[PDB]
Swiss-Prot record:
The chain holds residues 6 to 94 of 217 of the full protein. Widely expressed. Keywords: Coiled coil, Golgi apparatus, Membrane, Protein transport, Transmembrane, Transmembrane helix, Transport. Belongs to the VTI1 family. V-SNARE that mediates vesicle transport pathways through interactions with t-SNAREs on the target membrane. These interactions are proposed to mediate aspects of the specificity of vesicle trafficking and to promote fusion of the lipid bilayers. Involved in vesicular transport from the late endosomes to the trans-Golgi network. Along with VAMP7, involved in an non-conventional RAB1-dependent traffic route to the cell surface used by KCNIP1 and KCND2. May be concerned with increased secretion of cytokines associated with cellular senescence. This is Vesicle transport through interaction with t-SNAREs homolog 1A. One of its GO terms (biological process) is vesicle fusion with Golgi apparatus. GO terms for molecular function: SNAP receptor activity. Interacts with distinct SNARE complexes that contain either STX5 or STX6. Interacts with NAPA and, to a lesser extent, with NAPG. Identified in a complex containing STX6, STX12, VAMP4 and VTI1A. The keyword Protein transport applies. It is found in: Golgi apparatus membrane. Its main location: Golgi. Residues 33-94 form a coiled coil. The lineage of its organism: Eukaryota, Metazoa, Chordata, Craniata, Vertebrata. GO terms for cellular component: clathrin-coated vesicle; cytosol; endosome; Golgi membrane; neuron projection terminus; neuronal cell body; perinuclear region of cytoplasm; SNARE complex.
Length: 102
């Protein structure tokens, strides 16, 4: 026998997600109608998947002490900002019907 798994962390994951997402979001307007359709959906998942994070992270940072909360807070604000934006830039990318200059 030889199996197991134990890895903690949220920001990291999320960060990766948001990133991987943002990128894909920037690719949405640069993807075909064959990969876009799915992509526009693939982001919908990675998004919601990160949505819960902000919830868990916030639902956690709460219990966190004022001696550790450090950074987490300054970040919490950042994430949210981005996250919410991701929900926008995402739709502002799938609304691209080609090159769409401007």
């Amino acid at each position: 026998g030889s199996s197991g798994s134990s890895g903690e962390g949220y920001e990291q994951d999320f960060a990766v997600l948001t990133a991987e997402i943002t990128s894909k979001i920037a690719r949405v307007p640069r993807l075909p109608p064959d990969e876009k359709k799915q992509m526009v959906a693939n982001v919908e998942k990675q998004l919601e998947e990160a949505r819960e994070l902000l919830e868990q992270m916030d639902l956690e940072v709460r219990e966190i002490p004022p001696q550790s909360r450090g950074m987490y807070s300054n970040r919490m604000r950042s994430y949210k900002q981005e996250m919410g934006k991701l929900e926008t830039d995402f739709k502002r990318s799938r609304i691209a019907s080609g090159p769409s200059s401007g």
